[PDB]
Amino acid sequence: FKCVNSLKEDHNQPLFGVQFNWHSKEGDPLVFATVGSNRVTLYECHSQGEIRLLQSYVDADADENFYTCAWTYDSNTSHPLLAVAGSRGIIRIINPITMQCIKHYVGHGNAINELKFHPRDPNLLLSVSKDHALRLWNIQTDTLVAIFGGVEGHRDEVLSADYDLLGEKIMSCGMDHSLKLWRINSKRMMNAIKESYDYNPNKTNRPFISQKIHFPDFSTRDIHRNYVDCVRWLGDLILSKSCENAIVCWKPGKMEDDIDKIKPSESNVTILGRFDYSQCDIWYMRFSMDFWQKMLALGNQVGKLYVWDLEVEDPHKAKCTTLTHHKCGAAIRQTSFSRDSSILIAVCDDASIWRWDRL
Numbered sequence: 050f051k052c053v054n055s056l057k058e059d060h061n062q063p064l065f066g067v068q069f070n071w072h073s074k075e076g077d078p079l080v081f082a083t084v085g086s087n088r089v090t091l092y093e094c095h096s097q098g099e100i101r102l103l104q105s106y107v108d109a110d111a112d113e114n115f116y117t118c119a120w121t122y123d124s125n126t127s128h129p130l131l132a133v134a135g136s137r138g139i140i141r142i143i144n145p146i147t148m149q150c151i152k153h154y155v156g157h158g159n160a161i162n163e164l165k166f167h168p169r170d171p172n173l174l175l176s177v178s179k180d181h182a183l184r185l186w187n188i189q190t191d192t193l194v195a196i197f198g199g200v201e202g203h204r205d206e207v208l209s210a211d212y213d214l215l216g217e218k219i220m221s222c223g224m225d226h227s228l229k230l231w232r233i234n235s236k237r238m239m240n241a242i243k244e245s246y247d248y249n250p251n252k253t254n255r256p257f258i259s260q261k262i263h264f265p266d267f268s269t270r271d272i273h274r275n276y277v278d279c280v281r282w283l284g285d286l287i288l289s290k291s292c293e294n295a296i297v298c299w300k301p302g303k304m305e306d307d308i309d310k311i312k313p314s315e316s317n318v319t320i321l322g323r324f325d326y327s328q329c330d331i332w333y334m335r336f337s338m339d340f341w342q343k344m345l346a347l348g349n350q351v352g353k354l355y356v357w358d359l360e361v362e363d364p365h366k367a368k369c370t371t372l373t374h375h376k377c378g379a380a381i382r383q384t385s386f387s388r389d390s391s392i393l394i395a396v397c398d399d400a401s402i403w404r405w406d407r408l
């Protein structure tokens with residue numbers, strides 16, 4: 050990769066999130082969103098490294114701090130949608146064409162640290178919160194499907210979560226040092242999702258009942274020894290990080306144990322590898338993968354990017370390269386690959402945005 054451009058947003062506050070729109074249409078330029086301060090901004094990538102500024106949504110509350118965003122599309126029209134959330138605990142669904150807010154969701158109103166859309170269902174939105182819970186929403190019927198919590202759930206802020214390939218299960222992580230698995234292909238959760246689609250408050254008297262899921266299907270505190278701030282599935286394996294200068298590749302159970310036969314009492318984990326790096330020992334730094342899961346990127350606290358090629362026979366064989374620029378010195382909170390991995394964008398604590406193009 051080579052650095053082709055950079056810019057700084059006028060608010061001078063940390064950029065906490067960046068996401069390419071992997072649903073952008075054939076023959077349209079590549080578009081990414083950034084979140085920081087109380088705003089979300091869209092940019093288009095053009096030739097000669099140009100990053101073209103489009104339009105922002107600015108929250109009416111000056112004390113809102115957006116922490117996360119996620120792209121989906123309208124399941125009836127195919128038009129793109131953007132979900133954003135942060136410190137106020139309000140999920141906003143934004144029309145990215147006009148940047149109008151279309152609607153919003155409040156849970157209990159505590160900070161939301163990450164949003165993720167289900168990989169097969171564009172209406173199913175997962176939020177993770179400072180209140181120790183995850184929430185699954187159906188943004189077609191405007192229903193809260195389920196809350197994942199209880200004393201056997203997380204015991205401090207939830208910082209990240211990820212759906213597996215088919216969206217049959219979720220792995221979550223946070224400040225309690227634990228990683229927890231939640232199956233959403235149980236008969237109970239499949240029924241709840243079905244009921245959420247059948248719910249129309251204009252045609253019934255009942256409120257929609259949300260499931261309370263109080264028991265994860267697996268839990269470990271044996272991977273990391275500090276806050277776990279990012280997690281992603283790699284097939285049936287997990288990649289996760291803390292602030293110990295490492296991304297760990299691991300799985301529940303013993304080497305030969307099938308993920309779908311793991312019982313909630315499983316006490317073992319298997320470590321398949323670990324990707325070390327330097328100067329990323331502050332809390333709240335995310336890694337990202339490309340659409341095909343061929344590539345992994347992480348930025349560190351002094352502006353260096355690490356990129357791993359995962360197109361190798363076993364996880365521990367991943368090939369690392371590093372990307373530095375003499376003017377890029379601030380902490381990189383998140384990266385995003387374009388769908389094809391031709392562009393990598395990094396965003397920073399000084400409101401700076403860095404574009405790297407594949408050679």
Ligand SMILES: CN(C)[C@H]1CN([C@H]2CCc3cccc(F)c32)C[C@@H]1c1ccc(N2CCN(S(C)(=O)=O)CC2)cc1
Pocket residue numbers: 063065116117162163206207208209278279333334335382398399
């Ligand atoms: C748990 N809460 C408190 C965090 C979570 N984090 C989110 C968004 C980024 C990220 C990455 C991984 C996991 C996450 F949950 C999150 C949002 C919250 C937060 C608040 C303030 C800051 N600081 C930035 C750096 N500066 S500065 C540039 O020195 O002014 C001082 C504020 C850092 C993070």
